[model samples]
Target: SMEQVAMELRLTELTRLLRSVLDQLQDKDPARIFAQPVSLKEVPDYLDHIKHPMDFATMRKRLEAQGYKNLHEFEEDFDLIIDNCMKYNARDTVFYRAAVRLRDQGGVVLRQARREVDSIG
Candidate 1:
């Protein structure tokens, strides 16, 4: 049960870090955008562009559900949301710019979490 204990401890930090990073990321989105799932909005044919969708709500629910075996899966969800934004919106658009900001800033936050995880684990 030693491995089991370690796994539990590791995941305790993992989940908390993900939660913290998500909160910070959503806060950066002042309009409260990206905090929810994308729907048929001002942008048309969104489904036509993004086959798979991701957002803060989905990520939170999934994280809340708690079956992640590794940290990388959580990171991939971020890509899905950001890349979907990149694919759907024009470079000059607010969504596009916001996506870039989220992608970069979110990365730094994740990096910090990873460092903490490593330092302790």
Candidate 2:
């Protein structure tokens, strides 16, 4: 419980810092960031192979509730989630697949963040 609480607090601050960074980077537009089409909407189907059945609606609503305005808002949480999965489910084949998916998405987020920061630099 403490770890979850601490992670929530950390994510709150991380989201704010990311938003601030994006704002300072040539007026990066949140709308444009979201407007960019996700090339692989079916990518979540990969999660169906796991236990959760790929509930994007629940994930989207939860992210919105947590103040995630864009993918960058919770980029750190992607890695955090994967780490937790590895810690708690290291031997679970399905869980490993889920973690791999998160890592893939995190890689995309990291690349986007790097591009944003480079523009600011």
Candidate 3:
């Protein structure tokens, strides 16, 4: 049930991101790109489209698609969001331990989630 576990973890992790986004909205920070309303709800879909390498090219494309004129706008906080998500989930040591006990499934699922964050920019 790695999918179930990842689903749960992702849900928890994403809730933190949503809270952060909401916080930024209240603070009136433009760098908090997802702080905007419609884009906030679309986070899961955006996460799905992300692939490996998490390179700048993909970020440019995604930002362009989202109607941002300058990718530099989000450059600063983008990495912070992804790092917080990954490190927070990885902090669930018991979850990782349970996965290790099962097989290698836990690590793989975590890696996939990490990859999803890679393009989160």
Candidate 4:
């Protein structure tokens, strides 16, 4: 029964790693465009076009709710946020450009966090 000790420890460690990495992206997102959910009223067909849309608000506190099983799971959410943006917004749009930028920035952050997650094994 106590075998779950490492499981909880790993989860909490991942949580801390996510929190720090999130803050880094927050600084990079100067426009604050990704800070909240995209409005359906603005693009009524958003969900239709970008299925399983991800957002900052929902992605932010999932640590206490639906926790990620691994750093890769955490990354799926991170990538989906950008992937949705890339799929919906045109290449010339600020939204598209921001997604591209965030994806690159996120790569570096994950590299750092991945090392830590890999260590607690």
List model 1 lDDT by residue over 1-121, tens digit each: 9999988878877787778877877777777668888876865677788899888899999887775545688878878989988988899999999999888878877788668767776
Clashing pairs in model 1, backbone N/Cα/C closer than 3 A: none
lDDT of 4: 0.80
Indicate whether candidate 1 or candidate 3 has the larger lDDT. 1
Shift in Å, residue 110, candidate 1: 1.7
> lDDT per residue, candidate 2, 1-121, as tens digits?
9998987876666455565533333122222222222224744443443332322233344554666645544554444445545554556576556666645644655686768545643
Model 4: per-residue Cα lDDT over 1-121, one tens digit each: 5768877777777787777877876677788878888888988977789789787777787855637777788789888889888888899999999989888877787798889778864
How many clashes show up in model 4? 0
Candidate 4's displacement at residue 21, Å, is 1.8
Count residue pairs with overlapping backbones in model 3: 0
* Candidate 4: regions farther than 4 A off: none
lDDT of the structure predicted as candidate 3: 0.39
Index of the highest-lDDT prediction: 1
Q: How close is candidate 3 to the true structure, as a TM-score?
A: 0.25
TM-score computed on alpha carbons, candidate 2? 0.36
lDDT of each: 0.80, 0.48, 0.39, 0.80
Off by over 4 Å in 2: 1-73, 117-121
Candidate 1 — which residues are off by over 4 angstroms?
1-6, 40-44
Reference-based TM-score of each model: 0.83, 0.36, 0.25, 0.88
For model 1, give the RMSD to the true fold. Answer: 2.3
Ranking by TM-score: 4, 1, 2, 3
Worst 10 residues of 4 by lDDT: 61-70
Which window of ten consecutive residues has the lowest lDDT sum in model 2?
Answer: 26-35
